[PDB]
Design a protein around this ligand. Structure first.
Ligand SMILES: N[C@@H](Cc1ccc(C(=O)c2ccccc2)cc1)C(=O)O
Ligand SMILES: N[C@@H](Cc1ccc(C(=O)c2ccccc2)cc1)C(=O)O
Lengths: 306, 306
């Protein structure tokens, strides 16, 4: 159905009941926000892919190019941030996402919007605010006041934009729980899993350089996956297995030499999971297959950006 | 001279050099802000008296009825706060202060003013911000985000108002130091001492009920001073001695029975300080004299409010 179609590959939906009530409505909107990023990676793609699922399910899509938030989170100057946001819009369009793209500053600095921010600041403890920025705040030995304004700003935007569904990675859940409590109208939160970095040490990040950009070249992709963390029989924290699960189409024909078993055909990721977990599928073979399928996947996108 | 006239009874002037440069200018402005208070006490009077000193010295006076700050500091709703601010203006006018009175919200919610607040939030650490609100923040077991917005708001207002001199109690110095660092144009800070409460346990405060309101009745004043902390020979932390120092005119004729030494005439507070410190002047006699002089002082003000 549509519900499960949307539920597929998500970490959680804050209230599947509320989401069912939403699917009944004729006009429904889903929204996601991104601090403009210099490089758009699989992490972003995973989420845009999810926005497309919702769109296919009749949701109007709202993409917030969060320039003010990025400004508050030390990403630089607004106009500079604004141009990177511009580029992101194109990469998002290149991914096949037809939607309403809006910057945050045009309305996030409005007289009333601000009074609402201060109203929320009166009900948001500093400890609660600091906690929600743990996975989002730019690393800083001397946390700025801006760090705690950021979360309440995100909450006021959810109010302003008035979407039925808000999508984001699991790292956004605390700011989302905060909004669930502070806001009068409860919005459904769809949380996407956070991909692991290629080296498997942490989560995939634009600043940690452990990602695969959607416009990376075929050679770059092959080289990135080749060096990627991928222990035989290990699925948890295996970035390569995550890519197979979140981006690959099945049945998947893992091509390999007869000398090693010959071409293998997997009808589902779960099946691939078994084969790899039971060490019947070798890392090098998993990689070559993921790398080639991924390249095909991203090609259309890279072509458009070029 | 004018300098010392302004320096009289102040705790500190952040840069007496800068203050001298200011006195040379033809047009100079001095400003002070108050979170609207239900009762205006000696603490406020001390500061308005100081604003008048500056006014007599050719300064244009700006009085900020800080409704937004009070809102941020949990004083209630803006309109309610706005009406108490209205009443304060009259009490201030009743004190003989002719000046420009402005609320903060009319300009503190402006698009650019807000972006400037966020700019400042990017250079103000949370620890630095928390520290400046130690003597100002409303008591709260769960510090709100609003607490740290307050200080940067005060700093942006100093920028906006563009006064040459900013006046306030010593409890405001950390927020003032913060402004000295963050702002491009350095404004002179004149800090007034903080009066001790009548019970001598803490500082005089509108919420601690240890103050003398300028419109208190003669009977109320007499009764408040009678019960006031005032150890014989002790000057430090003696609220009664502070009142004699900051509000009384000299020579001061301390009236008392011949049975106890008869009427005494002191030509200066310093002299009074000696007499009291050397236990030659009794607390009860100090009180009766301060109480009667204070009543005369405030009378004009109380009459006008009635
Ligand atoms: N916090 C996200 C960026 C972000 C997400 C969401 C928001 C919203 O307030 C929003 C957008 C769309 C719908 C509802 C709410 C602003 C900014 C990040 O770390 O990149
Ligand atoms: N913090 C003060 C109130 C306050 C003082 C000063 C200000 C200003 O920003 C200001 C006013 C006038 C001039 C310069 C600066 C705002 C609010 C209090 O505890 O009551």
């Amino acid at each position: 159905d549509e519900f499960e179609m949307i539920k597929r590959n998500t970490s959680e939906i804050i209230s599947e009941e509320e989401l069912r009530e939403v699917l009944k409505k004729d006009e429904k909107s889903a929204g996601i926000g991104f601090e403009p990023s210099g490089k758009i990676h699989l992490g972003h793609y995973l989420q845009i892919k999810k926005m497309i699922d919702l769109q296919n399910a009749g949701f109007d899509i709202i993409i917030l190019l969060a320039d003010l938030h990025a400004y508050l989170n030390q990403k630089g100057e607004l106009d500079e941030i604004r141009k990177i946001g511009d580029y992101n819009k194109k990469v998002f369009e290149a991914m096949g996402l037809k939607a309403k793209y809006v910057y945050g500053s045009p309305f996030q600095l409005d007289k009333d919007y601000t009074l609402n921010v201060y109203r929320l600041a009166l009900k948001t403890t500093l400890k609660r605010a600091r906690r929600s920025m743990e996975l989002i705040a730019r690393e800083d030995e001397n946390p700025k006041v801006a760090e705690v304004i950021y979360p309440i700003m995100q909450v006021n935007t959810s109010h302003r934009l008035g979407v039925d569904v808000a999508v984001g990675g699991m790292e956004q859940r605390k700011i989302h729980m905060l909004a669930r409590e502070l806001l009068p109208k409860k919005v459904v939160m769809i949380h996407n899993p956070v991909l692991t970095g290629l080296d498997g040490e942490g989560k995939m990040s634009s600043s940690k350089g452990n990602f695969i950009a959607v416009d990376d070249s075929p050679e770059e992709i092959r080289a990135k996956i080749k060096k990627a963390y991928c222990p035989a029989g290990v699925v948890e924290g295996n970035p390569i297995m995550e890519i197979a699960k979140y981006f690959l189409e099945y049945p998947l024909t893992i091509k390999r030499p007869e000398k090693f078993g010959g071409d293998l055909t997997v009808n589902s990721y779960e099946e691939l999971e078994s084969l790899f977990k039971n060490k019947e599928l070798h890392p090098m073979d998993l990689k070559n297959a993921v790398a080639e399928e991924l390249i095909k996947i991203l090609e259309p996108i890279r072509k458009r950006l070029l």
